[PDB]
Design a protein around this ligand. Structure first.
Ligand SMILES: CC(=O)N[C@@H]1[C@@H](O)[C@H](O[C@@H]2O[C@H](CO)[C@@H](O)[C@H](O)[C@H]2NC(C)=O)[C@@H](CO)O[C@@H]1O
Ligand SMILES: CC(=O)N[C@@H]1[C@@H](O)[C@H](O[C@@H]2O[C@H](CO)[C@@H](O)[C@H](O)[C@H]2NC(C)=O)[C@@H](CO)O[C@@H]1O
Lengths: 485, 485
C-alpha cells in the first residue's frame, strides 16, 4: 500500500508499506521473498529511505525505478517494512505509480495443463458426465508416442497416464539390457501425483530411479544378482539396494533438508529424510508414495532456481536451443552433480551461444554426470516415451485410494492449509468419483491408467490455489539472489 | 527442575519440568534436542504423563527409568514441558533421583586437546611467559612425523602447526604426480582455526581439497592444463576450477543448507553458500578463510551424527578396529557419498565384526567413493603427515591478523554470542600477544607455523564455552533419532 504524504513545492513525498500481514500460517504466505519492487515516475528520485532508518538500494532506468531491499527482502509472518520516497516533480507522470512487488521466483515459469475436469463439475452431487467429457477418447487404448523429457509440455493424453514399460537396449548401469517395471501401485500413484501436481513426466522419474538404484528396472543379465521377480513366467533380477536410506531416487539428506527449507507449504517441520525416502520390499512402506513426490520437488527446485535467476531468458533458451532434450539434460545433470555444477557451466550467460547451438548439449559441455547419468536417463525416458505395446495399468480399490490420501495427508502440507472439514469434503467427492468411475469396470475397482488422473483432479479441486507454491524463506533468498548460471 | 507434589499412602507423585528458559538467543541454548531423560527409583512406576494431556514413552530397566519424549523432544526458546510421575513406594531409594537429560549428541565424543596457554595467562597485561610455557620446544624446528587422519588425536607438537608440503607419487586425479601447496596465508589461517576449533588435521583438509578440485596441489604433469604457478625456482600447473561455486572443497548448497540448520551457533541466518565457498585467484577473497572452516564443520557433522546414533560403540570401534585409518576412511567416504551411504554399510550394527577385523576397511566394504576418493585422501594425508623437510610457514603482520578476525566476526557466530565489548577486549589481548610474539622475529611479524596457534588460543579464551556447540534444531532431531548405522 502507498500514500502521498505531502506535495510541497516541487517535492513529492510518498510512503510505501510492504508487509506480510499474515499472523499465522496460510498457504503460500508463510514467507515472502522479494527480489525487488519497481515503480514508474517521470520525476527525479531525490531519496528512498526506510522510515525506521537506513536505506535500500535503488536504480533508475528511464521512467522505471527498481528498489532492492538487500538484507531486508525477507518477510516472515507479521513483518512490515515502510519506505519513504521523495520525488522532484517533472514530466507528465511524476507521481510514483504502477508499483509491482517482484517475488524471488520466475514470473514466466511454464507449468503445462495436462487436462481439466469438465466445466460442469462441482463438489457434492456431480454425475458421471461431470467427470468424463468424452468417453470414446477417455477409454481409447490407442497410444500416441511422444518425446517429452522432464516436463510434460505435450501430454500424449489428457486423462490417461501412460507409463511405457519398454525393453531397454541401452547398457543400464553396465548391464547388457533391462526392462522397465513398476514395483507396486502405491508407487505408481505417487508418480501420478508428481505428474499432475508438478507436471513431471512419469517416464522421466522412472528412468531416474532406474539409473540411481535400479528402482524401476529389472534385467536378465546374470552378472546382476538381485531379488528374483517373475514376470509372465520369465525370471528377472531386480538389482535394487532396497534398504538404502536414500531410496530408489538416491536423494541425500542435505538436499532433503534444503527442499524442506524452501518449501514450508509442501513439507511439515516433522518431515524426516529416511522416513520419506527409504523403501523396502513391503509395498505398504509409505516411502513408496512419498519418495517420487520428494524427487519431483527436488527436480522442481532446480527448475525454479534457474527461472528465479535468469527470468525471461529461460523460455528464450527453450525456444532457441538446437538440442530438443537440452532442458532435461540440464535438470538431470543438476540432479546428479548439484545446482552449483549447473551454475559453473554458464549456459545462460558466458556460454549462451555455444549452448543454444549445440546439437547434443551434454557432449559439448561435458555434462555427463557420474556413471553416464545424463545419457542413460535421457535415453531411457525417450525409449519409454515411444513405447506403445506395454503400458502400465493396475486395479485400484477404494481401500487403495483411501490409503493413498491418508499418506498424502500425513506426509504433505502444513496444518492450516486444508482444514479437517475441507479434507472430509474432498474425500466424499473422491469416493463419489471412485464409485461412478468404477461402474465401467464392473464396480469393484477403477483403472490406474484410465481413471486415476481424474481422481486426482477431483481431489485437487479442494486444494489451496495456486496448487504449486513458491519456494521461499531465508535460505532460498540468499541462494537464489546469489545464483548466476 | 523436579518436585515431590505429594506422598500419600504408598503413592509418591513427582512433577518434572523440562524447559528451555532462554527467551533470546544464548550460546548453545538456542534449541535443546532431547534424546531421552533418565532417573532412578527402587519403587514401581505407576504412570508417567504430561501435565497438559497425553503421555511420553518410557521403559524400566531395573532401577533405571528412561523417558522418551518422541514428538515433544525439541525445545526452542521459551518452551516448557511438564511431566507427572507416580511411584509406588518400595525399596531403599524410592524417590525419583539422579535425573539426567540426555541430549541428542554423543556424550563420549572425543575432542583432543592440542595445547593450552600456560595456567598463569589472564586477560590484560599478560607477559611472554604467560604465552610460552617452554621456549625451547616452542621454537624447536625439528619435525616429528605422525599418522593422524581426520582428527588430531596425537598432535606432533602442541604449539606449532605442521602442514607437510610433500611431493605426491600417488596418481592424484590421474596426474602422474603432484606437489602440495598452500595457496595463500589467509587460507592457512582458516585451516589453523579449523584445527584448533574442531581438532581437524590440516593435512586431511589439504588432501581433501586436492582430490575435490586441485585446491591445494599443483603438478608438473603437462596433460593437466591449469593456472601457471611458480614456487621458488619451479613452475607448475594448478588445475583448480577456481571459479567453481562449490569451491575447492566442493561443498554443495544442500549440504551447506543442512549444516546451517544444524549449527545455528556457528552460522548466522545470512550465511550464503556461494559467498562462503566460492574462492578466486585473489587472496583477499573471504572464502579462502571461510571455506576450510565450512568443510571442517561438514566433516564434524558426520562424526557428531555417528556419535549421536551409536554412543559408546563409537569409541569401542576406534579401540578395536584393525585398520588404523578406519575412522578417516568412514568420514571421508561419508563426505563424498553422504551419511546415508555410511548408514547403508551397517559398520556399527549388522557388519560390526567384519568391520573391526578388516585390515583395510574401505576395500572390504567397497567404500572407495567416486574417483578413488577414499584411497586418494588417505594416501595424501598420510604422506603429508610423514613430511619433515618442507613445512609450511608464512609471515603474518598485524594487518593480516586483524583482517582474519574481521572475517571471522562477519561470517561466524550470531548476535548475542559475543558482545561488542567482549570482542574489543579480545582483540586487545590478540594485539598484545601479536606484539609480544613478534619480538622474537625482530618485531615486524609473527610466524604462522610457530605463533598462530597461540594467537588463536588467546582469542578463544574470550569465546563462549564449551567452544564446540551441539548440533541442534528440528532437522537434527528427526535425522539423528532415525539414523541407524
Ligand atoms: C558405470 C556405472 O554405470 N555404474 C553404476 C552406478 O552408477 C550405479 O550407482 C549409482 O550411481 C549414481 C550416479 O550415477 C549415484 O548417484 C547413485 O547414488 C548410485 N547408486 C547407489 C545405490 O550407490 C550402480 C547402482 O547399483 O550401478 C552401477 O554400478
Ligand atoms: C578418475 C579421477 O580421479 N577423476 C578426477 C575427478 O575425481 C576430479 O573431480 C572431482 O571428483 C570428486 C569425486 O571424486 C567430486 O566430488 C568433485 O566434485 C569433482 N570436482 C569437480 C570440479 O567437478 C577432477 C578434478 O578436476 O579430476 C579428475 O577428473
Amino acid at each position: 500500500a502507498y500514500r502521498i504524504v505531502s506535495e510541497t513545492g516541487d517535492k513529492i513525498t510518498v510512503e510505501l508499506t510492504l508487509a506480510n500481514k499474515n499472523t499465522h500460517y496460510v498457504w503460500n504466505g508463510w514467507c515472502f521473498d522479494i527480489k525487488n519492487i519497481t515503480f514508474e515516475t517521470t520525476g527525479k528520485v531525490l531519496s528512498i529511505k526506510y522510515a525506521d532508518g537506513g536505506e535500500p538500494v535503488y536504480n533508475v532506468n528511464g521512467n522505471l525505478v527498481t528498489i532492492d531491499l538487500t538484507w531486508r527482502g525477507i518477510f516472515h509472518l507479521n513483518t512490515t517494512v515502510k519506505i519513504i520516497i521523495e520525488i522532484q516533480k517533472s514530466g507528465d507522470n511524476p507521481y510514483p505509480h504502477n508499483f509491482k512487488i517482484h517475488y524471488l521466483r520466475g514470473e514466466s515459469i511454464i507449468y503445462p495443463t495436462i487436462g481439466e475436469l469438465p466445466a460442469s463439475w462441482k463438489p457434492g452431487n456431480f454425475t458421471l458426465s461431470d467427470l468424463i467429457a468424452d468417453p470414446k477418447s477417455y477409454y481409447d487404448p490407442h497410444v500416441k508416442p511422444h518425446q517429452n523429457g522432464f516436463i510434460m509440455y505435450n501430454p500424449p493424453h489428457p486423462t490417461q497416464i501412460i507409463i511405457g514399460l519398454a525393453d531397454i537396449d541401452y547398457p543400464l548401469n553396465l548391464a547388457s539390457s533391462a526392462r522397465m517395471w513398476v514395483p507396486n501401485k502405491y508407487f505408481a500413484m505417487g508418480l501420478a501425483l508428481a505428474y499432475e501436481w508438478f507436471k513431471v513426466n512419469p517416464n522421466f522419474l522412472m528412468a531416474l530411479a532406474a539409473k540411481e538404484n535400479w528402482g524401476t528396472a529389472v534385467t536378465k543379465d546374470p552378472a546382476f544378482k538381485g531379488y528374483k521377480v517373475i514376470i509372465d513366467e520369465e525370471e528377472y533380477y531386480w538389482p535394487v539396494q532396497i534398504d538404502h536410506p536414500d531410496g530408489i531416487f538416491q536423494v541425500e539428506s542435505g538436499n532433503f533438508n534444503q527442499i524442506k527449507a524452501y518449501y514450508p507449504d509442501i513439507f511439515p517441520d516433522t518431515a524426516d529424510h529416511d522416513d520419506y525416502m527409504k523403501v523396502s520390499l513391503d509395498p505398504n512402506d509409505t516411502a513408496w508414495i512419498t519418495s517420487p513426490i520428494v524427487a519431483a520437488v527436488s527436480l522442481t527446485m532446480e527448475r525454479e532456481l534457474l527461472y528465479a535467476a535468469v527470468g525471461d531468458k529461460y523460455n528464450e533458451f527453450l525456444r532457441l536451443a538446437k538440442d530438443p532434450w537440452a532442458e532435461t539434460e540440464i535438470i538431470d545433470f543438476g540432479y546428479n552433480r548439484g545446482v552449483g555444477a549447473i551454475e559453473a557451466l554458464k549456459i545462460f550467460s558466458d556460454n549462451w551461444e555455444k549452448a543454444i547451438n549445440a546439437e547434443v548439449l551434454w557432449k559439448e559441455f561435458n555434462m555427463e554426470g557420474f556413471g553416464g547419468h545424463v545419457p542413460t536417463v535421457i535415453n531411457i525416458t525417450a525409449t519409454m516415451d515411444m513405447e506403445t505395446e506395454r503400458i502400465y495399468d493396475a486395479n485400484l480399490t477404494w481401500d487403495d485410494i483411501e490409503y493413498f490420501f491418508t499418506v498424502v495427508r500425513q506426509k504433505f502440507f502444513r496444518p492450516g492449509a486444508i482444514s479437517d472439514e475441507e479434507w472430509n469434503a474432498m474425500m466424499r467427492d473422491v469416493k463419489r468419483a471412485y464409485d461412478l468411475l468404477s461402474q465401467h469396470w464392473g464396480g469393484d475397482h477403477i483403472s490406474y491408467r484410465y481413471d486415476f488422473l481424474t481422481i486426482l483432479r477431483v481431489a485437487m479441486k479442494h486444494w489451496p490455489e495456486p496448487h504449486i507454491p513458491r519456494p521461499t524463506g531465508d535460505d532460498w533468498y540468499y541462494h537464489a539472489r546469489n545464483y548466476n548460471p
